[PDB]
Ligand binder design. Structure first.
Ligand SMILES: O=C(NC[C@H]1O[C@@H](n2ccc(=O)[nH]c2=O)[C@H](O)[C@@H]1O)[C@@H](CO)n1cc(-c2ccccc2)nn1
Ligand SMILES: CCCCCCCCO[C@@H]1O[C@H](CO)[C@H](O)[C@H](O)[C@H]1O[C@@H]1O[C@@H](C)[C@@H](O)[C@@H](O)[C@@H]1O
Length: 277
C-alpha cells in the first residue's frame, strides 16, 4: 500500500504530451519527460526493495570509458535504489576505483571475430542463468562509451524494454537499417517493423533479458553456420526479437542520444544518457 501523497491531479482532458506518441499500439508506455511522476514510481519500486543490475562491457581500449561512465551513473542512475554494476572486461586491473553511494556495488567479471560479435549476448545470457537471477530483479544492458547527464530511474523498469535509436525515431520503417537479406535470422521485410531499437540500451526482468539474449545468441550462431553476419550485428537480432516479442515499455531517445551528431531537438526536454565525443 502506498502512503498518502500530495501531487497534482492527472487531468484526463489534458494530454501529457501533444508532440509525441506516448503509448505504443500494443499499449506499452513510451517514456518521455512529462509522462511520469517519479515520486509515485519511486514509492512503488522502493516498497518492493527493487535491485537493478547494470551490465557494461569494456574490452581493450574501451576500459578508458569506465571512469566517466561509472561516476555519472552514480549521479543519475537509479539513485536511492539498490544497484549492482557488472563490468565485463579483459583487463580487471584497468577498472577504475570509483566511489559508490550506499546500497550500490560493483563486480568485475573477466572475459575469432565471430565469437567477439556474439560475446555480449552469450555472456549476458550465461550470467542471467547464474549470478543475475539470485542478485537482481531487473537488468539494464548498455554501451560503455557513454555518460549519464540526467535522471535515469525506475520509470524504465518493466518486464522487457527497448530504446528508440536516436538516428531513426522520426524515420519511416522502409528507411530503418534492419537486416534485409532473407538468408539471415535477423531478416525484417520492408513492410514490417514498429521502431528501430538501439543495441546500446535494453533491459527488463532477469527472466525476460535471459530469453532475449539467449534467442539473439542462438540466432547469431545459426547465421554464423550459414556464413552471414547481420548488417548491425547483435542490434539487428535485437530488432528482430523485439518485433516478434513486443516490449512492455519503450524508452524515448532521451535515454540514448548523441549531441555531437544530432544536436538538442525541441522534442527532447532532457538528454539523459549520451555518447561521449
Ligand atoms: O561495438 C559495438 N558497440 C559498442 C560497445 O561494444 C563494446 N566494445 C566495442 C569495441 C571494443 O573494442 N571494446 C568494447 O568494449 C563497448 O561496450 C562499446 O560501448 C557494436 C557496434 O556495431 N558491435 C560491433 C560488433 C562487432 C563485433 C565483432 C565483429 C564485428 C562487429 N558487435 N557489436
Ligand atoms: C537517416 C539519418 C542519418 C543519421 C543517423 C545517425 C545515427 C547512426 O548511428 C548508427 O546507427 C547504426 C544503425 O544504423 C548503428 O546503431 C550504429 O551503432 C550507430 O552508431 C552509433 O550511435 C550514433 C548515435 C553515434 O554515437 C555513433 O558514434 C555510434 O557508433
Amino acid at each position: 500500500s502506498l502512503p498518502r501523497m500530495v501531487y497534482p491531479q492527472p487531468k484526463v482532458l489534458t494530454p501529457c504530451r501533444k508532440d509525441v506518441l506516448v503509448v505504443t499500439p500494443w499499449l506499452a508506455p513510451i517514456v518521455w519527460e512529462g509522462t511520469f511522476n517519479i515520486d509515485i514510481l519511486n514509492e512503488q519500486f522502493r516498497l518492493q526493495n527493487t535491485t537493478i543490475g547494470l551490465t557494461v562491457f569494456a574490452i581493450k581500449k574501451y576500459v578508458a570509458f569506465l571512469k566517466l561512465f561509472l561516476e555519472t551513473a552514480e549521479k543519475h542512475f537509479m539513485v536511492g535504489h539498490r544497484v549492482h554494476y557488472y563490468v565485463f572486461t579483459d583487463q580487471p586491473a584497468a577498472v577504475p576505483r570509483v566511489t559508490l553511494g550506499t546500497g550500490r556495488q560493483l563486480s568485475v567479471l573477466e572475459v575469432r571475430w565471430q565469437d567477439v560479435s556474439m560475446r555480449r549476448m552469450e555472456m549476458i545470457s550465461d550470467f542471467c542463468e547464474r549470478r543475475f537471477l539470485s542478485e537482481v530483479d531487473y537488468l539494464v544492458c548498455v554501451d560503455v562509451d557513454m555518460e549519464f547527464r540526467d535522471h535515469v530511474g525506475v520509470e524504465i523498469l518493466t518486464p522487457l524494454f527497448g530504446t528508440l535509436h536516436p538516428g531513426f525515431y522520426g524515420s519511416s520503417r522502409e528507411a530503418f537499417t534492419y537486416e534485409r537479406r532473407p538468408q539471415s535470422q535477423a531478416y525484417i521485410p520492408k513492410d514490417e517493423g514498429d521502431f528501430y531499437y538501439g543495441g546500446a540500451f535494453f533491459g527488463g526482468s532477469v527472466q525476460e533479458v535471459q530469453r532475449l539474449t539467449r534467442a539473439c545468441h542462438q540466432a547469431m550462431m545459426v547465421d554464423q553456420a550459414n556464413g552471414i553476419e547481420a548488417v548491425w550485428h547483435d542490434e539487428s537480432h535485437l530488432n528482430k526479437y523485439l518485433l516478434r516479442h513486443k516490449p512492455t515499455k519503450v524508452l524515448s531517445p532521451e535515454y540514448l542520444w548523441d549531441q555531437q551528431l544530432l544536436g538538442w531537438p525541441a522534442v527532447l526536454r532532457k538528454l539523459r544518457f549520451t555518447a561521449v565525443p
